[PDB]
Design a protein around this ligand. Structure first.
Ligand SMILES: C[As](C)(=O)[O-]
Ligand SMILES: C[As](C)(=O)[O-]
Ligand SMILES: C[As](C)(=O)[O-]
Ligand SMILES: C[As](C)(=O)[O-]
Ligand SMILES: [Zn+2]
Ligand SMILES: [Zn+2]
Ligand SMILES: [Zn+2]
Ligand SMILES: [Zn+2]
Ligand SMILES: [Zn+2]
Ligand SMILES: [Zn+2]
Ligand SMILES: [Zn+2]
Ligand SMILES: [Zn+2]
Lengths: 116, 116, 116, 116
């Protein structure tokens, strides 16, 4: 998997399960074209989002539906969602892990970029 | 100031100076209408973005131009920018501080919401 | 104030009120000598911890009683406390802000170091 | 492995390699008895720290030698080290992942606690 998304819940100290994750790729005209989508499993990651071949050079956006996640736990959170926007694979293929750590009024995101 | 944005640099342990901050408000048709803009001063905050009166109930987006900030320090960062999207002032006026802590491959954002 | 401590609650989006903060200074024999102590007010900061004069060059430890803070809100947290250990004022006086952002199973701390 | 430590570098967007990790367990008299130690590999984790059997109920301290890590990269960091202190396994065995995200003037730590 060259693109992995890992979501953690800082209130419960657990992976965040059943979080919607959307990936878009910026198109020729600058609109966000849907690229992939998934829901996090028990490990806090969605199932294989893409392959090395399909994951071409470009600008990507990962959106994580944090608001729905909290609401479903009976918590009213601050953010509508969390997004990460980055350029990928512009000096050859890399593997990307986007980690998001969630609290109701805060979140952190970090990228771990390795060689394949 | 009912809307304050505070940007910190985790590499230098300093406020992030000269960072562009944009605020948008979601319009009737769901497009992001420009609402305010500023550049952080030496304290890492832009100059008074709005007033209590203009800061009406609605969905707001704060974008922080993190990529340009790092590039100008000769660092090549991961994110294109950082954004915070939230609903504001829907149960009366509140004061909002959006804090962003920046590193080249990571950032955290938190909201402090108080009464006026 | 050359040493400020700012504690935020990421679950409530508020300053963390009534948090115990302890400061120690490493002594000649390497034991931690009590240096200052306070409880955060409504702004999430303890009252003036020290003066520029008393805040001499040395190794300092700031402990924040996060466990008691959460327990008192009826939450059972992961950490026993949070600590920050750093050398201060070894190239002349600096002003130090230690910011701590708290969730029940996570916390972040950052230092902002400025000239007086 | 019931106790895992994962260290990430937010400046480089990589696992933090060759970081010293120490684990202590609080003893009958309240002194910190050495429990385990390791250095992070290329994945940012030390090699198997303990077993389910040896990892008994008690208060543990994990120290991460962040200062040496940064210094060795020619960076002068703020913190002397990072520590996490917590009670473990007091309602039966759990698996603990302590994640630390490092920048020169900041760090975050989070715990992921699962059932075996
Ligand atoms: C609620 As959404 C991040 O799928 O537009
Ligand atoms: C580079 As921008 C966040 O002003 O579109
Ligand atoms: C509970 As304490 C950080 O005052 O030893
Ligand atoms: C430098 As150390 C955290 O091993 O005392
Ligand atoms: Zn969605
Ligand atoms: Zn968005
Ligand atoms: Zn801009
Ligand atoms: Zn964006
Ligand atoms: Zn105390
Ligand atoms: Zn401690
Ligand atoms: Zn050591
Ligand atoms: Zn320590």
């Amino acid at each position: 998997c060259p693109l992995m998304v890992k979501v953690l819940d800082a209130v419960r100290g657990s992976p965040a399960i059943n979080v919607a994750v959307h990936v878009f790729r910026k198109a020729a005209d600058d609109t966000w074209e849907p690229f992939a989508s998934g829901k996090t499993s028990e490990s806090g990651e969605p199932h294989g989002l893409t392959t090395e071949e399909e994951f071409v050079e470009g600008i990507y956006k990962v959106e994580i539906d944090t608001k729905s996640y909290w609401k479903a736990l009976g918590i009213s959170p601050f953010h509508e969602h969390a997004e990460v926007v980055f350029t990928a694979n512009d000096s050859g293929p890399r593997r990307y892990t986007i980690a998001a750590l969630l609290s109701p009024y805060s979140y952190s995101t970090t990228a771990v970029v390795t060689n394949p």
